[PDB]
Design a protein around this nucleic acid. Structure first.
Length: 58
RNA sequence: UAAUACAGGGUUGAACUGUGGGUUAGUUUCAAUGCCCAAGGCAGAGCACUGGAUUGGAUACCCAGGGAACUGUGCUCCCAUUAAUAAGAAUCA
């Protein structure tokens, strides 16, 4: 029974790994096929400055 | 800050890579104007200076003219010296 359990677990793990690989490969292929998107939103002049802890201790 | 030429950086993705970093002097690339030097030299405007006024009075503010300075792989970094109150990690959806 232990051996049969191990064999069934192996088969299930093989199937799961193959499915995961196919999904990931498809996603990355689609990413590659897509043309680079150009960020067209607002800029970061507000974020250029930072407000950290003032004085010593920072 | 149109096009073109030569170079970055940023953003997005794929691949690669596999603790390969954070900070930094016996370090040095860059860096407003002025000054020194060199260039040119009369588009504009404009220190000193001249003369036309106001003022007890003005060496100024106002007006007219003006040969100092205004474009440099040079000399070069003084400063109320440049995106701030140094840089990095953690805490947040």
């Amino acid at each position: 029974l232990c051996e049969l359990e191990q064999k069934k677990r192996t088969e299930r793990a093989i199937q799961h790994s193959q499915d995961l690989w196919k999904k990931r490969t498809a996603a990355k292929d689609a990413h590659s096929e897509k043309t680079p998107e150009l960020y067209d939103g607002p800029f970061w002049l507000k974020f250029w400055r930072r407000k950290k802890r003032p004085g010593a201790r920072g």
